[PDB]
Amino acid sequence: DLGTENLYFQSNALLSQRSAWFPRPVAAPAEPPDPAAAPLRLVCFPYAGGTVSAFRGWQERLGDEVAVVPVQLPGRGLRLRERPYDTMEPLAEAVADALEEHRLTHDYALFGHSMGALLAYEVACVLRRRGAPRPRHLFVSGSRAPHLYGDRADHTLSDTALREVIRDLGGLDDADTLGAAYFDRRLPVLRADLRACERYDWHPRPPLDCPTTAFSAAADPIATPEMVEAWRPYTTGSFLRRHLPGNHFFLNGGPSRDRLLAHLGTEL
Template sequence: MPTAPTGIGVQRPVSSPRGLWFSGVTASPATIRLVCFAHAGGAPSVFRDWPTHLGPHVDVVPVLLPGRGLRLWEPASTDIRELAQEVATALIEQCLLDRYAFFGHSMGALLAYEVACVLRERRAAAPERLFVSGSRAPHLYGSSLGTDLSDDALLAWIRELGGLLGSGARSQFDRRLPTLRADLRACESYRPQPQQPLDCPLSVFSAKGDLIADEEQADQWREYTAVSMRRRHFPGGHFYLVGPHRFSLLRELRGELARYAPAPGSSTPARDGQRMHP
């Protein structure tokens, strides 16, 4: 099995061909790359139409985790920190850290944060900004999120959160069930390690009526950045990003990412503080 560097003098097995971790990587003239992490049980398809809404200066790169899509044959991970190590290795191998930001929703927010911490440990380039959505702060994880429920009860819980509605929901749920349970176990077993706050700014998005992450729980992300934190609160519940209220989120993202587009008459985008760790 091939290996990839995880730090000076350390080698780690690569569990999957490098090209399978990311979809949508292009040689476009975009000025910033938005690496996107989906919710528990989610897949890159959540971000399918984001390039249309975020503009030509943003290259949207969804992360394809084991247990879904072309990686359905791989077992989904139940360890957030181990998964973060593997994602960080893939990002470094594929040279995707020249100018980038992270977006993560729910479990994806937790994973995006851990990947940012791993990259800092490896002295890699830091993200321009970390966008977290539908997620309580990392130290508030560890309670039950549904792995103790029967299949029927878990489906009812997902529907109460606003997901898997409409015809075909049951068959879709059954296909995703092993991956969903693995993802939920990863969140339930997660315990954050003591870390210095990140030196990139945060944008924290929450939604009214979210039963997973309320406003107060989302506010506590503030202690995870040494720079600045921007807060927005939307209607729509936990799965607002796949319903009609997602357009409010997309407008917000487009506005924040627009600052990285080149200024009129210039080919050089503005930078937002220090991006390399000494």
């Protein structure tokens, strides 16, 4: 019997290929949104010796409902010819002046890492005393609470000694390939920035009113759950601590960066 009644289905060889069930994912069409018109503006502050570069790629990860507005402090990038501030208060006042002048003091949140967390805090306090609108949210990472600053004296150490602390903390993994000479470029700005945190002495004041989310890191000696837990009374709004796997310089890239961004996205 060679007739058509006697025919049988055979395994479909096309379906054995990976791409039949699992096509490779597809990138979306690549804005960015205008800071002036965005529903929310996330004003971001770097760590000591850092620049707005830390925030590259945040915009694409966070999407179109928030404008990422990194702040470039004097002494770096296009501002390389300007003396860096070395005291927290005038810096925070100059940032507050800049935010007001450029009309960034509505529908905004603040983010800062390490020194930039303290700066973000100090900026929130200055804006409050001026009667400006409060932030929608304050995000701090890699930072102990303000009253816990003052312990350290890194900005006094020698070039080599300071560089080794930065290396030790995870800020100099590049050196393996780029050589350490690269880093010495940053020394004057790093020292100025560091002086602002290290000579800081928290004077008691009322807590803020904005929600605050703080991030601790498992491998950060200076961001342990309890140093970061200490931010809790600095606001009369809701407080959350989220814990991350990385070190003091996780901002630079990896799982912790991705998770920070995710957490940020949940609260914006």
